[PDB]
Design a protein around this ligand. Sequence first.
Ligand SMILES: Cc1cc2nc3c(=O)[nH]c(=O)nc-3n(C[C@@H](O)[C@H](O)[C@@H](O)COP(=O)(O)OP(=O)(O)OC[C@H]3O[C@@H](n4cnc5c(N)ncnc54)[C@H](O)[C@@H]3O)c2cc1C
Ligand SMILES: Cc1cc2nc3c(=O)[nH]c(=O)nc-3n(C[C@@H](O)[C@H](O)[C@@H](O)COP(=O)(O)OP(=O)(O)OC[C@H]3O[C@@H](n4cnc5c(N)ncnc54)[C@H](O)[C@@H]3O)c2cc1C
Ligand SMILES: Nc1ccccc1C(=O)O
Ligand SMILES: Nc1ccccc1C(=O)O
Lengths: 340, 340
Amino acid sequence: MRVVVIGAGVIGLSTALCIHERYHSVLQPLDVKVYADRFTPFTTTDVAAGLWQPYTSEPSNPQEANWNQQTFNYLLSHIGSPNAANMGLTPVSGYNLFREAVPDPYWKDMVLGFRKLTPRELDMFPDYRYGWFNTSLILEGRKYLQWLTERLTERGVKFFLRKVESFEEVARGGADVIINCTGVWAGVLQPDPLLQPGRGQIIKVDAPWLKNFIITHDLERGIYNSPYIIPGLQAVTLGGTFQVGNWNEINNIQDHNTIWEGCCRLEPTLKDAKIVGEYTGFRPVRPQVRLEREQLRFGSSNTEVIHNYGHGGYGLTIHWGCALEVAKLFGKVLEERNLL
Amino acid sequence: MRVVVIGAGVIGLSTALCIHERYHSVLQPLDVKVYADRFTPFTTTDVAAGLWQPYTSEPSNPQEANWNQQTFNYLLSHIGSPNAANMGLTPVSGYNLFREAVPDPYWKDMVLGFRKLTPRELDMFPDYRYGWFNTSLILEGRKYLQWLTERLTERGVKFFLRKVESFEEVARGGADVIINCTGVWAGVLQPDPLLQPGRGQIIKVDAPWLKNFIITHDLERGIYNSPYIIPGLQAVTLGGTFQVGNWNEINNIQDHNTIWEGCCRLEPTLKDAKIVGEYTGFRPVRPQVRLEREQLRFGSSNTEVIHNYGHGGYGLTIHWGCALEVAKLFGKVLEERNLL
Ligand SMILES: Cc1cc2nc3c(=O)[nH]c(=O)nc-3n(C[C@@H](O)[C@H](O)[C@@H](O)COP(=O)(O)OP(=O)(O)OC[C@H]3O[C@@H](n4cnc5c(N)ncnc54)[C@H](O)[C@@H]3O)c2cc1C
Ligand SMILES: Cc1cc2nc3c(=O)[nH]c(=O)nc-3n(C[C@@H](O)[C@H](O)[C@@H](O)COP(=O)(O)OP(=O)(O)OC[C@H]3O[C@@H](n4cnc5c(N)ncnc54)[C@H](O)[C@@H]3O)c2cc1C
Ligand SMILES: Nc1ccccc1C(=O)O
Ligand SMILES: Nc1ccccc1C(=O)O
């Protein structure tokens, strides 16, 4: 079987791994190749704050809730083991701050020990009068991608640096099944007017004393268009922009001041922090995650394509649920071919 | 008035500043000198793990409960301000794990968001079936000491490296009021059978990925004779020895092994951690905190002596409530001798 994954971000590699584990023993040659024009440090995943937290609003597709759940559990199960940190995994507690009372998120029972903030805790955040506290996990994009790559590589997965112009060429290449995990750039392979970029900029700072994550929410400006501080494995992410439709790939000084200025007010001690880097990435926004099979004929070429992209700003959070769903779909592909 | 404070640890310096802040505006010449033979990096306070957490056991002297409270509130008020991290302060959340069910601590309502761990949270710690989770504060001893010193220095307080062989010499030295904050060595200046050292050894390792504190409790071996992981500002403290009656100042190999092994079992990721330093210190173990006024005549001298020592393993945790008490006792002196 020749499977070609197009994409080397969290979604692409998780899907590749999940498949190899799942069918390597039943399928004779399970040729798995990864095609991508951007690898590790250059993918959107590397710009991710690295926190597990779905949107505060219910998913359009309920199945996405299950996928989020499955991902937390999968990751939680790696906590009590060495190498957990090596794969970019670590527990972290934090605050979700609001200027007004809001309803509980559907994911309240998924995270560890969720509760509302007491007035004495809210005294530490004088600009907010409502909030939640909870424990969750940090899944550092880059570290995780390096890990996956290590696991994929030793699994016999070959990686190829190349921009696919069309599924057709991959199909002509001999790919029996193509897993499309191209993120925000999916519309290029196939027009998808529902897929649009959610430009986000972040500042990575060196402020080790910061132990808890702090996410402020502005219901007026929309999700993530508010300052947040997310401590990672060894640097803190300062952020605050979510601009849908914007394709500007360059760091905007406009945003730099909003983020920095917004974060230092939240955390005055940030004044002593040292800036390590400024990044911009496009969250693959879509009303629903596109995860489905699609047949392509080409006359005696009938290639199978399984899509899995458009995970907006919850790609690290839902990654395993989607990967498992793709493996399940890949299973049907084999059953159609009587491959078991 | 000439006040001589003996001791440069958290207790000494805290008392010095509190007295100075309070009376420097009303006392005519307020001469405050701090005598000490061991300064900052070499005091027990620098070896301290840096967590604010009283004993799980009820307080002997009911008043210590209140001092612990006063201190937490004093520290908490620095949270929302810059320099909080410069004085060694930073919020931290963590677990207190038990092998058996235990009543809540008297301080359950002093810390932020106290609650018991859930079975699913306990699945992260297979060796224990009970525990609490709560948010407390980190007060890096060394940093706090440097901070206090700077404040005291710009306040006009003078520091002298000297070993006070007795109170008398100091009294004869022209000391109207002597604040005795000699910690575990107070027995030398005045025999105290109730004061015994609770030697403790710790290992400071570099493991930035650890954001939460984990403290294990084994009732059979007594307080702090069980593995604990306390993340500091920019290093983690591993520990677990509370040896009363032990006067050994050098690092024990067996103790190194008790800490390292036990901590790696609790937290497996500790394997990638680079050991930064190994230290031993003596908690001033005493059934009660000695904090009282004592009159030493010496024939015509009649020097006031206020003791403030025997804070066991909660010196950082109680420091402020005590300094405020000393400052109160000091006020009385002023009124008696009619200086105010
Ligand atoms: C500021 C910011 C913060 C965020 N923080 C979080 C967070 O803390 N939590 C969370 O869950 N989510 C977060 N995200 C969301 C985000 O990380 C996404 O969900 C993203 O990681 C989804 O992964 P992906 O594999 O779909 O995309 P990507 O990482 O972008 O990978 C896409 C891959 O496809 C390849 N590719 C594309 N087109 C082609 C082509 N034509 N030919 C060959 N190769 C191609 C690319 O090279 C790349 O390898 C954040 C995003 C941003 C930008
Ligand atoms: C491993 C360990 C972990 C601990 N962790 C915590 C923790 O996380 N939380 C917490 O609340 N506390 C902790 N402690 C408790 C501990 O730090 C004490 O409570 C301590 O700081 C009390 O402070 P002190 O000022 O009395 O003594 P010290 O800080 O030791 O200072 C005593 C001072 O007296 C001086 N002195 C003594 N005799 C003379 C003399 N005759 N002449 C001149 N000067 C003299 C000494 O030189 C020194 O300057 C821990 C202790 C240890 C060892
Ligand atoms: N997905 C996230 C989770 C937490 C904080 C920020 C983000 C973000 O989209 O930038
Ligand atoms: N007082 C403490 C608080 C937390 C961890 C250790 C200690 C200790 O005394 O060693």
